[PDB]
Amino acid sequence: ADTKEVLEAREAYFKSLGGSMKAMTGVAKAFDAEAAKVEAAKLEKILATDVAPLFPAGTSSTDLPGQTEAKAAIWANMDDFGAKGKAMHEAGGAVIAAANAGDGAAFGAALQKLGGTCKACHDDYREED
């Protein structure tokens, strides 16, 4: 009965940024205008979210053995990890910008940057799972 509250919330933070990516990749494919704007909205929620507020004393896979899937791996100290955070935000706010600006190519390329950004993170914590 771990009941990881801090982690669980982080799970939500993953669904948030992960939502921007999803709505971003679909909008990226079958774009138009309405989808992009909506993705942007989800984006902003992620952008101004507060990444540094759910990534801390969690499970820590790399630390010691345990269930989980990924926790301590990440590969990048609190600083580097913090970086990817902001980086994701770079795509976050910039993608929403394209949404408003109506730059479908700007929102597609920007959101893809966030795509490889978040993805890159997971690619970092190449945990066992």
CSV table of all heavy atoms in Angstrom, one decimal, residues 21-61, unseen atoms left out:
chain,number,residue,atom,x,y,z
A,21,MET,N,1.3,16.8,-25.5
A,21,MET,CA,1.9,16.0,-26.5
A,21,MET,C,0.9,15.2,-27.3
A,21,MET,O,1.0,15.2,-28.6
A,21,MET,CB,2.9,15.0,-25.8
A,22,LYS,N,-0.1,14.6,-26.7
A,22,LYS,CA,-1.1,13.8,-27.4
A,22,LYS,C,-1.9,14.7,-28.3
A,22,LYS,O,-1.9,14.5,-29.5
A,22,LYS,CB,-2.0,13.1,-26.3
A,23,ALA,N,-2.6,15.7,-27.7
A,23,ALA,CA,-3.3,16.7,-28.4
A,23,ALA,C,-2.5,17.4,-29.4
A,23,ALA,O,-3.0,18.0,-30.4
A,23,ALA,CB,-4.0,17.7,-27.4
A,24,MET,N,-1.2,17.4,-29.2
A,24,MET,CA,-0.2,18.1,-30.0
A,24,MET,C,0.1,17.2,-31.2
A,24,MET,O,0.3,17.8,-32.3
A,24,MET,CB,1.1,18.3,-29.2
A,25,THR,N,0.3,15.9,-31.0
A,25,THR,CA,0.6,15.0,-32.1
A,25,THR,C,-0.6,14.7,-33.0
A,25,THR,O,-0.4,14.5,-34.2
A,25,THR,CB,1.1,13.7,-31.5
A,26,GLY,N,-1.8,14.8,-32.4
A,26,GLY,CA,-3.0,14.6,-33.2
A,26,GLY,C,-3.3,15.9,-34.0
A,26,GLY,O,-3.6,15.8,-35.2
A,27,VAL,N,-3.2,17.0,-33.3
A,27,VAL,CA,-3.4,18.3,-33.9
A,27,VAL,C,-2.3,18.4,-34.9
A,27,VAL,O,-2.5,19.0,-36.0
A,27,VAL,CB,-3.3,19.4,-32.8
A,28,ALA,N,-1.1,17.9,-34.7
A,28,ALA,CA,0.0,18.0,-35.6
A,28,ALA,C,-0.4,17.3,-36.9
A,28,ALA,O,-0.1,17.7,-38.0
A,28,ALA,CB,1.2,17.3,-34.9
A,29,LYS,N,-1.0,16.1,-36.8
A,29,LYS,CA,-1.4,15.3,-37.9
A,29,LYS,C,-2.6,16.0,-38.6
A,29,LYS,O,-2.5,16.6,-39.7
A,29,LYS,CB,-1.7,13.9,-37.5
A,30,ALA,N,-3.8,15.8,-38.0
A,30,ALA,CA,-5.0,16.4,-38.5
A,30,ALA,C,-5.3,17.8,-38.0
A,30,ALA,O,-6.3,18.0,-37.3
A,30,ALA,CB,-6.2,15.4,-38.2
A,31,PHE,N,-4.4,18.7,-38.3
A,31,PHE,CA,-4.5,20.1,-37.8
A,31,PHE,C,-5.7,20.8,-38.5
A,31,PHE,O,-6.4,20.1,-39.3
A,31,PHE,CB,-3.2,20.8,-38.0
A,32,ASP,N,-5.8,22.0,-38.2
A,32,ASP,CA,-6.9,22.8,-38.8
A,32,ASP,C,-6.9,24.2,-38.1
A,32,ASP,O,-6.6,25.2,-38.8
A,32,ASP,CB,-8.2,22.2,-38.5
A,33,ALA,N,-7.2,24.3,-36.8
A,33,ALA,CA,-7.2,25.5,-36.1
A,33,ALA,C,-7.8,25.3,-34.7
A,33,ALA,O,-7.2,25.7,-33.7
A,33,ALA,CB,-8.0,26.6,-36.8
A,34,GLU,N,-8.9,24.6,-34.7
A,34,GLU,CA,-9.6,24.3,-33.4
A,34,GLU,C,-8.8,23.4,-32.5
A,34,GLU,O,-8.7,23.7,-31.4
A,34,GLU,CB,-11.0,23.7,-33.8
A,35,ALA,N,-8.3,22.3,-33.1
A,35,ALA,CA,-7.5,21.4,-32.3
A,35,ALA,C,-6.3,22.1,-31.7
A,35,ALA,O,-6.1,22.0,-30.5
A,35,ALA,CB,-7.1,20.2,-33.2
A,36,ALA,N,-5.5,22.7,-32.5
A,36,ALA,CA,-4.3,23.4,-32.1
A,36,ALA,C,-4.6,24.3,-30.9
A,36,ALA,O,-3.9,24.2,-29.8
A,36,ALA,CB,-3.7,24.2,-33.2
A,37,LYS,N,-5.6,25.2,-31.0
A,37,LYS,CA,-5.9,26.1,-29.9
A,37,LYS,C,-6.2,25.3,-28.6
A,37,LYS,O,-5.7,25.6,-27.6
A,37,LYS,CB,-7.2,26.8,-30.3
A,38,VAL,N,-7.0,24.2,-28.7
A,38,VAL,CA,-7.3,23.3,-27.6
A,38,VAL,C,-6.1,22.7,-27.0
A,38,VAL,O,-5.9,22.6,-25.8
A,38,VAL,CB,-8.3,22.3,-28.0
A,39,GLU,N,-5.1,22.3,-27.9
A,39,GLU,CA,-3.9,21.7,-27.4
A,39,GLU,C,-3.1,22.7,-26.6
A,39,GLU,O,-2.6,22.5,-25.5
A,39,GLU,CB,-3.1,21.2,-28.6
A,40,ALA,N,-3.1,23.9,-27.2
A,40,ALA,CA,-2.4,25.1,-26.6
A,40,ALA,C,-2.9,25.3,-25.1
A,40,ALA,O,-2.2,25.4,-24.2
A,40,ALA,CB,-2.6,26.3,-27.4
A,41,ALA,N,-4.3,25.2,-25.0
A,41,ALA,CA,-4.9,25.4,-23.7
A,41,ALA,C,-4.3,24.4,-22.7
A,41,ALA,O,-3.9,24.7,-21.6
A,41,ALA,CB,-6.4,25.2,-23.8
A,42,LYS,N,-4.3,23.1,-23.1
A,42,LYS,CA,-3.7,22.1,-22.3
A,42,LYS,C,-2.3,22.4,-22.0
A,42,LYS,O,-1.8,22.2,-20.9
A,42,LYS,CB,-3.8,20.7,-23.0
A,43,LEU,N,-1.6,22.9,-23.0
A,43,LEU,CA,-0.2,23.3,-23.0
A,43,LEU,C,0.0,24.3,-21.8
A,43,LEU,O,0.6,23.9,-20.9
A,43,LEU,CB,0.2,23.9,-24.3
A,44,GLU,N,-0.6,25.5,-21.9
A,44,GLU,CA,-0.5,26.5,-20.9
A,44,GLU,C,-0.7,25.9,-19.5
A,44,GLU,O,0.1,26.3,-18.6
A,44,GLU,CB,-1.5,27.6,-21.2
A,45,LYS,N,-1.6,25.0,-19.3
A,45,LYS,CA,-1.8,24.4,-18.1
A,45,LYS,C,-0.6,23.7,-17.6
A,45,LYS,O,-0.2,23.8,-16.4
A,45,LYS,CB,-3.0,23.3,-18.2
A,46,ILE,N,0.1,23.1,-18.6
A,46,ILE,CA,1.4,22.4,-18.3
A,46,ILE,C,2.5,23.4,-18.1
A,46,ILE,O,3.3,23.3,-17.1
A,46,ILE,CB,1.7,21.4,-19.4
A,47,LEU,N,2.6,24.3,-19.0
A,47,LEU,CA,3.6,25.4,-19.0
A,47,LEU,C,3.7,26.1,-17.6
A,47,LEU,O,4.8,26.0,-17.0
A,47,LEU,CB,3.3,26.4,-20.1
A,48,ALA,N,2.6,26.7,-17.2
A,48,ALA,CA,2.6,27.4,-15.9
A,48,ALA,C,2.4,26.5,-14.7
A,48,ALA,O,2.2,26.9,-13.6
A,48,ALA,CB,1.5,28.5,-16.0
A,49,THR,N,2.4,25.2,-15.0
A,49,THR,CA,2.1,24.2,-14.0
A,49,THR,C,2.9,24.3,-12.7
A,49,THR,O,2.3,24.7,-11.7
A,49,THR,CB,2.3,22.8,-14.6
A,50,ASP,N,4.2,24.0,-12.8
A,50,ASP,CA,5.2,24.0,-11.7
A,50,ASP,C,5.8,22.7,-11.7
A,50,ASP,O,5.5,21.9,-10.8
A,50,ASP,CB,4.6,24.4,-10.4
A,51,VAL,N,6.7,22.4,-12.6
A,51,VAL,CA,7.4,21.1,-12.7
A,51,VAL,C,8.1,20.8,-11.4
A,51,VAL,O,7.8,19.7,-10.8
A,51,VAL,CB,8.4,21.1,-13.8
A,52,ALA,N,8.9,21.7,-10.9
A,52,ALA,CA,9.6,21.5,-9.6
A,52,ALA,C,8.6,21.6,-8.5
A,52,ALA,O,8.5,22.6,-7.8
A,52,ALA,CB,10.7,22.6,-9.5
A,53,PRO,N,7.8,20.5,-8.3
A,53,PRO,CA,6.9,20.5,-7.2
A,53,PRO,C,6.2,19.1,-7.1
A,53,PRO,O,5.3,18.9,-6.3
A,53,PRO,CB,7.5,20.9,-5.9
A,54,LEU,N,6.8,18.1,-7.8
A,54,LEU,CA,6.3,16.7,-7.8
A,54,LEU,C,7.4,15.8,-8.0
A,54,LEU,O,7.2,14.6,-8.0
A,54,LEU,CB,5.2,16.6,-8.8
A,55,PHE,N,8.6,16.3,-8.3
A,55,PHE,CA,9.8,15.4,-8.5
A,55,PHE,C,10.8,15.6,-7.4
A,55,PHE,O,11.6,16.5,-7.4
A,55,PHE,CB,10.5,15.9,-9.8
A,56,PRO,N,10.7,14.7,-6.4
A,56,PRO,CA,11.5,14.8,-5.2
A,56,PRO,C,11.5,13.4,-4.5
A,56,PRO,O,11.5,12.4,-5.2
A,56,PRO,CB,11.0,15.9,-4.3
A,57,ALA,N,11.6,13.4,-3.2
A,57,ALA,CA,11.7,12.2,-2.4
A,57,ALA,C,10.5,11.3,-2.8
A,57,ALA,O,9.5,11.2,-2.1
A,57,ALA,CB,11.5,12.6,-0.9
A,58,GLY,N,10.7,10.6,-3.9
A,58,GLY,CA,9.7,9.7,-4.5
A,58,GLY,C,10.1,8.2,-4.1
A,58,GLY,O,10.5,7.9,-3.0
A,59,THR,N,10.1,7.3,-5.1
A,59,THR,CA,10.5,6.0,-4.9
A,59,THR,C,12.0,5.8,-5.1
A,59,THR,O,12.6,5.2,-4.2
A,59,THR,CB,9.8,5.1,-6.0
A,60,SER,N,12.6,6.4,-6.1
A,60,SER,CA,14.0,6.3,-6.4
A,60,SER,C,14.4,4.9,-6.7
A,60,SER,O,14.9,4.2,-5.9
A,60,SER,CB,14.7,6.8,-5.1
A,61,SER,N,14.2,4.5,-8.0
A,61,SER,CA,14.5,3.2,-8.5
A,61,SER,C,16.0,3.0,-8.4
A,61,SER,O,16.5,2.0,-7.8
A,61,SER,CB,14.0,3.0,-9.9
